[PDB]
Amino acid sequence: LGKLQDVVNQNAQALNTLVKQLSSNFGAISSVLNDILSRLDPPEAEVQID
Amino acid sequence: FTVEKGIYQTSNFRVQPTESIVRFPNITNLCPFGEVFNATRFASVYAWNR
Amino acid sequence: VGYQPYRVVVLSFELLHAPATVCGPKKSTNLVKNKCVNFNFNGLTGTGVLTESNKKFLPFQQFGRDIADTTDAVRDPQTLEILDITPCSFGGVSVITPGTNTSNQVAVLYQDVNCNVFQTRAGCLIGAEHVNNSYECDIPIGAGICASYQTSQSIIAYTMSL
Amino acid sequence: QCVNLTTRTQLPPAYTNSFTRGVYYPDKVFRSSVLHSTQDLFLPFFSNVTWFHAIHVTKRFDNPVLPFNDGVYFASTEKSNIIRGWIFGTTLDSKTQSLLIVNNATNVVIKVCEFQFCNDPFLGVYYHKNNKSWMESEFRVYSSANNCTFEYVSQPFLMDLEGKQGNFKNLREFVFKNIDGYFKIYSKHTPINLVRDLPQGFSALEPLVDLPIGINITRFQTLLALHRSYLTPGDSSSGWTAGAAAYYVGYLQPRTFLLKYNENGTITDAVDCALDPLSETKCTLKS
Ligand SMILES: *[C@@H]1O[C@H](CO)[C@@H](O)[C@H](O)[C@H]1NC(C)=O
Ligand SMILES: *[C@@H]1O[C@H](CO)[C@@H](O)[C@H](O)[C@H]1NC(C)=O
Ligand SMILES: *[C@@H]1O[C@H](CO)[C@@H](O)[C@H](O)[C@H]1NC(C)=O
Ligand SMILES: *[C@@H]1O[C@H](CO)[C@@H](O)[C@H](O)[C@H]1NC(C)=O
Ligand SMILES: *[C@@H]1O[C@H](CO)[C@@H](O)[C@H](O)[C@H]1NC(C)=O
Ligand SMILES: *[C@@H]1O[C@H](CO)[C@@H](O)[C@H](O)[C@H]1NC(C)=O
Ligand SMILES: *[C@@H]1O[C@H](CO)[C@@H](O)[C@H](O)[C@H]1NC(C)=O
Ligand SMILES: *[C@@H]1O[C@H](CO)[C@@H](O)[C@H](O)[C@H]1NC(C)=O
Ligand SMILES: *[C@@H]1O[C@H](CO)[C@@H](O)[C@H](O)[C@H]1NC(C)=O
Numbered sequence: 085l086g087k088l089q090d091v092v093n094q095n096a097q098a099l100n101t102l103v104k105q106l107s108s109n110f111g112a113i114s115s116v117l118n119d120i121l122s123r124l125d126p127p128e129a130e131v132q133i134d
Numbered sequence: 135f136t137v138e139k140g141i142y143q144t145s146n147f148r149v150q151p152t153e154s155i156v157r158f159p160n161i162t163n164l165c166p167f168g169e170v171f172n173a174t175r176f177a178s179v180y181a182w183n184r
Numbered sequence: 185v186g187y188q189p190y191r192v193v194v195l196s197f198e199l200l201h202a203p204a205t206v207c208g209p210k211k212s213t214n215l216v217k218n219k220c221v222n223f224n225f226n227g228l229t230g231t232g233v234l235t236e237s238n239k240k241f242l243p244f245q246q247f248g249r250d251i252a253d254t255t256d257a258v259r260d261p262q263t264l265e266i267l268d269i270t271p272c273s274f275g276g277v278s279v280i281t282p283g284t285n286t287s288n289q290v291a292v293l294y295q296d297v298n299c300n301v302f303q304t305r306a307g308c309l310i311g312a313e314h315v316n317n318s319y320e321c322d323i324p325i326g327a328g329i330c331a332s333y334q335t336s337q338s339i340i341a342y343t344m345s346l
Numbered sequence: 347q348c349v350n351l352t353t354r355t356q357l358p359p360a361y362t363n364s365f366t367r368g369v370y371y372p373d374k375v376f377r378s379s380v381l382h383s384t385q386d387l388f389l390p391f392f393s394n395v396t397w398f399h400a401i402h403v404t405k406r407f408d409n410p411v412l413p414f415n416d417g418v419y420f421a422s423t424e425k426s427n428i429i430r431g432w433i434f435g436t437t438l439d440s441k442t443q444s445l446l447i448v449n450n451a452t453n454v455v456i457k458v459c460e461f462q463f464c465n466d467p468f469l470g471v472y473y474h475k476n477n478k479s480w481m482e483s484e485f486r487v488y489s490s491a492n493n494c495t496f497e498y499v500s501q502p503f504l505m506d507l508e509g510k511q512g513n514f515k516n517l518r519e520f521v522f523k524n525i526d527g528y529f530k531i532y533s534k535h536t537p538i539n540l541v542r543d544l545p546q547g548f549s550a551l552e553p554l555v556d557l558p559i560g561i562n563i564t565r566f567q568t569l570l571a572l573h574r575s576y577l578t579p580g581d582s583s584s585g586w587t588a589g590a591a592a593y594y595v596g597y598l599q600p601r602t603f604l605l606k607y608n609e610n611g612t613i614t615d616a617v618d619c620a621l622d623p624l625s626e627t628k629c630t631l632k633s
Contacts, residue, residue: 138284139281139283141323141325143276146276156213158226160262246374251380
């Protein structure tokens, strides 16, 4: 069935892609926000958070 | 002021943990380091062991 | 005593961004399972429960990923047991209101939180009693169960009538 | 100390083809029923890999100082345990930190110092008249060393010092890598019944030891052990025997690999992306 499988597969990869978005740095020095908070003080790491 | 019949979402429920545990080893096991204290001879001050 | 050979060793420390490889911490604290706790197993700061898994890890690995690529499996370095990681906070809260000029009491519904109080299929519903009788429903809840204000009179939860 | 060899008739090196070889675990996590793609140094499939011979029946002994690229693949179909170990370094003249990975009959040591390496280090095995066993006597690998820091001793693996001329029964693979000065060793023993043209089977490689030296490596050389029986005069000039052995040396390249994981957690198949259009289609669709 093609009509009943694309509505599930496209949703499955869309939710899978959302998890993959958290693994990207978006040009910053780290992906997870807890790492840059531990390595740098919040006054200077504010631009990395934003 | 008026709320009609139906479902509504107000906030979110978060279960905050109350305890934290850290366990790096199973038991303390020091590495061999006796050569910097007990040795046949040492170095001088112009070129000291690092 | 004033001109004797003295072996001077200097033990300096460095202040820079890196995980503490050399440290003197507690070797083993108490082990707690089946509760949402926080752990630091050399690679993460994760808050979740530690269930007893049934999958055996190869004797060279430390972590464990899934299809969604999330750290949901860790190996305890104490005596080599495999513990799963599952978050304890799921979904949010919800409020059931009968409406204006009808009632004042309301019922609280939890989305995906496991527990007067009725354990429904769609989470936890509190403040509303459960009745085995089935009528037509007006306020949807989910999974074939609704809520309504019927006969004093209180808020009841029941399977909807088709 | 070391001695020099005498010129003789040798054999030119041969070139063979790899068949789904050189796949190892690139990370220390557990993966089950997933198809994860990673960027790491692997051996490309159906790549052109060098072949070196070590069989006596003639007098083949060719161990050049091959350059060390970004990761090497070393496969040996060892049967009589002729090969012993490997060395590493840049100039091998007691100026930089060289490596001695030698698997002796009693224990395995990892010594990384500035040993004075000769032009042909080797281990000599002598045959006693009274004792019907082979023991190693000529330990001619270096001359001396000045200073160094790192040292390691591995598990005492047992070696058989007897060499034969029969068919091979075991296959050993080794992968050596150096990223950020961090040494990586991957190995796995796999039995097989073949003499050449390695089978198309799949076997992932699990590491044994993980060593943080922190130096640079640009060259490497392998160590082979010969036998001194009653047939040979016993001089390392023109008369010697080496049994029957064959080892393959391959260089790793930066390639993206799609790894298949089962419910147990091991690697079953691998798909490349820069080898075949069908493989690229398989690895881009993640299926
Ligand atoms: C860690 O130490 C405990 C207590 O001695 C022991 O039971 C356990 O097997 C050890 N784990 C290792 C060596 O991996
Ligand atoms: C090393 O030297 C110190 C001081 O002389 C001595 O107390 C100690 O017993 C020696 N040995 C070791 C293993 O520390
Ligand atoms: C909710 O928790 C209780 C006790 O912790 C347990 O008995 C019950 O099985 C849980 N519900 C589900 C659906 O697992
Ligand atoms: C509804 O009736 C059934 C009939 O067997 C009974 O099992 C169930 O407990 C009743 N539910 C309530 C809430 O009384
Ligand atoms: C490997 O290279 C040699 C010469 O460089 C060539 O003769 C041989 O055909 C090559 N093998 C393959 C499989 O391309
Ligand atoms: C085996 O060779 C290693 C390499 O240096 C050496 O340290 C060890 O002593 C040797 N074993 C014996 C029994 O001589
Ligand atoms: C001797 O060891 C030190 C480290 O303790 C190293 O920096 C130095 O380069 C070594 N000597 C030589 C000649 O390499
Ligand atoms: C090792 O060699 C590389 C390339 O020749 C060089 O970039 C690096 O600085 C060297 N490291 C040391 C410690 O000599
Ligand atoms: C992996 O799973 C299969 C399927 O049940 C089983 O036969 C096999 O024994 C498992 N292997 C291990 C190491 O548990």
